[PDB]
Amino acid sequence: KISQYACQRRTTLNNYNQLFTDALDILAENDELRENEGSCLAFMRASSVLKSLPFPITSMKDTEGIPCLGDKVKSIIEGIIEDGESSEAKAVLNDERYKSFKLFTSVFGVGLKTAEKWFRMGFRTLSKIQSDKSLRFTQMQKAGFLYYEDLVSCVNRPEAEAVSMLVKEAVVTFLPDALVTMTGGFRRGKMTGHDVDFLITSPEATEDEEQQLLHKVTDFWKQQGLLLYCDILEDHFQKCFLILKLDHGRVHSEGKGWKAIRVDLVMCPYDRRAFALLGWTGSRQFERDLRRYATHERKMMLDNHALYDRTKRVFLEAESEEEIFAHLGLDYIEPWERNA
Ligand SMILES: Nc1ncnc2c1ncn2[C@@H]1O[C@H](COP(=O)(O)CP(=O)(O)OP(=O)(O)O)[C@@H](O)[C@H]1O
Ligand SMILES: [Mg+2]
Ligand code: NA
Ligand SMILES: [Zn+2]
Ligand SMILES: [Zn+2]
């Protein structure tokens, strides 16, 4: 029996139901833009469970016994079986509010509130936004527009590895015992991503040394002329959202000779490294279900910093992700099996 929880399913990148899940992902994204949290969650859970299937749905009979497939979702699956397309997802792709919100929030520094403001002002294109004489932009948005074409092109594995080298070189200069781990999509086996994420931790660094590392690393890059954008502002761990200048010569896999890359660095206390690694590896749906399973099935409270047992009234310690899964009573799910 397929569990309703992503943390009790193995979800690899070989999706046999991309026709269904691409449509369900568009409908979920539209509900997120329209602030319809409930309908968003229903489409996300349905899409997630279909991603775990070891076979493609080819008839409505194939959906029997699958959880998280409500009547609305089954109508969408039925329609795709009928003519290979989703009329509902096609209408979203042609909707002016959906097109505008996707386009505006694709700019680094632009969220739902700014996207909504620009749409209600009558803006539909980034060219008209950028060239407007009355609009005032945040420092994040200015960087978002300046490096737009590089940031909107996907980061591949040779680029991610070239960034990892840069991060490690900088970090070990100030903390030689530091452990630097690539997290996010790339840790789950993905070939591409919109950014590169790293978890940094040090077994011997003091509270002050831990606090100063991201300032030291970014000042070092600022001096080297590689820091294009930097925000050291917050999970509750110290983190930074950056734009780094990646020289093409550093990539072992034409233009200006470099590419702007979105990089996120997270510094955590050594003792919480397993909780942080688990939270930053993802996927988003895998994390949501892990936390929901912990609460509803185990009366435990899980986040990126700790695991608390409400019955035993104790915090549970872990040196690895495997120990967290064991505390929760779950079979271990490998990072490449967390693509829920
Ligand atoms: N601010 C935050 N607080 C807690 N957890 C976070 C977080 N930001 C991200 N995460 C978790 O860490 C991961 C990476 O951050 P993001 O780059 O924004 C999404 P991603 O799908 O994992 O990478 P992608 O750009 O390759 O698609 C996600 O899987 C996410 O669930
Ligand atoms: Mg990521
Ligand atoms: Na954005
Ligand atoms: Zn990120
Ligand atoms: Zn916390």
DSSP string, 77-134: HHHHHHHSS-HHHHHHHH-HHHHHHHHHHTSTT--HHHHHHHHHTT---HHHHHT-SS
How far apart CA 269 and CA 185 sit, in angstroms, is 23
- Given a contact cutoff of 8 angstroms between Cβ atoms, the answer to whether 196 and 243 are in contact is no
Question: Which active-site residues does the annotation give?
Answer: 195, 197, 264
How far apart CA 318 and CA 249 sit, in angstroms, is 40
Helix axis angle, 37-52 relative to 18-33, nearest 10°?
160
What CATH code would you report for 95-153? 1.10.150.20
- Given a contact cutoff of 8 angstroms between Cβ atoms, the answer to whether 182 and 193 are in contact is no
What CATH code would you report for 154-270? 3.30.460.10
- Given a contact cutoff of 8 angstroms between Cβ atoms, the answer to whether 230 and 218 are in contact is yes
Query: Cβ of 148: how many Cβ atoms within 10 Å?
Result: 16
Length of the chain: 340
| Distance between Cα 311 and ligand 1 center (Å) | 31
How far apart CA 159 and CA 156 sit, in angstroms, is 5
Burial class of residue 61 in the structure, from the number of CB atoms within 10 Å of its CB (0-12 exposed, 13-18 middle, 19+ buried): exposed
Nearest residue (CA) to ligand 1, atom 21: 185
Phi and psi at 271, nearest 5°, equal -65, -20
271-340 belongs to which CATH class?
A: alpha beta
Instruction: Return the structure tokens found at 241.
Output: 């959202």
List every span in the chain annotated with CATH 3.30.210.10: 271-340
Ligand 1: which atom is nearest the Cα of residue 193? 26
The DSSP line for 226-283 is -EEEEE-----SEEEEEEEEEEGGG-----SSEEEEEEEEEE--GGGHHHHHHHHH--
Name the pairing type of β-strands 258-267 and 196-201: parallel
Contacts of 16 (CB under 8 A, 6+ apart): 53, 54, 55, 56
Instruction: Return the structure tokens found at 118.
Output: 């620009």
Q: What is the CA radius of gyration of the chain?
A: 22
How far apart CA 53 and CA 47 sit, in angstroms, is 11
Give the experimental resolution in Å: 2.8
The DSSP symbol for 338 reads: B
Closest CA to 79 of 87, 67, 71: 87
Q: Please, what sign has the CA dihedral across residues 323, 324, 328, 331? A: negative
Residue 136, classed as helix, strand or coil, is coil
- Given a contact cutoff of 8 angstroms between Cβ atoms, the answer to whether 169 and 180 are in contact is no
Whether cis (ω within 30° of 0) applies to the bond prior to 283 is: yes
Ligand 1, residues at Cβ distance < 6 Å: 184-185, 190, 193-195, 197, 235, 279-280, 282-284, 287, 304
How far apart CA 302 and CA 307 sit, in angstroms, is 5
How far apart CA 316 and CA 297 sit, in angstroms, is 16
| Distance between Cα 197 and ligand 1 center (Å) | 8
| Distance between Cα 243 and ligand 3 center (Å) | 14
Contacts of 198 (CB under 8 A, 6+ apart): 164, 167, 180, 181, 182, 183, 263, 264, 265, 266
Technique used to solve these coordinates? X-ray
Nearest residue (CA) to ligand 1, atom 6: 280
Mutation probe of ligand 1 site: the residue of 183, 195, 236 with most atoms within 8 A of C-beta: 195
124 is in an annotated binding site: no
How far apart CA 114 and CA 94 sit, in angstroms, is 21
| Distance between Cα 305 and ligand 5 center (Å) | 5
The DSSP symbol for 334 reads: -
190 is in an annotated binding site: yes
236 is in an annotated binding site: no
What CATH code would you report for 1-94? 1.10.150.110
CA angle, 263 as apex, 257 and 264 as ends, to 5°? 170
List every span in the chain annotated with CATH 1.10.150.110: 1-94
The DSSP symbol for 68 reads: S
Closest CA to 129 of 112, 117, 113, 139: 117
How far apart CA 276 and CA 280 sit, in angstroms, is 6
303 is in an annotated binding site: no
Q: Which residue has the tokens 């590689």?
A: 226
Contacts of 250 (CB under 8 A, 6+ apart): 162, 165, 166
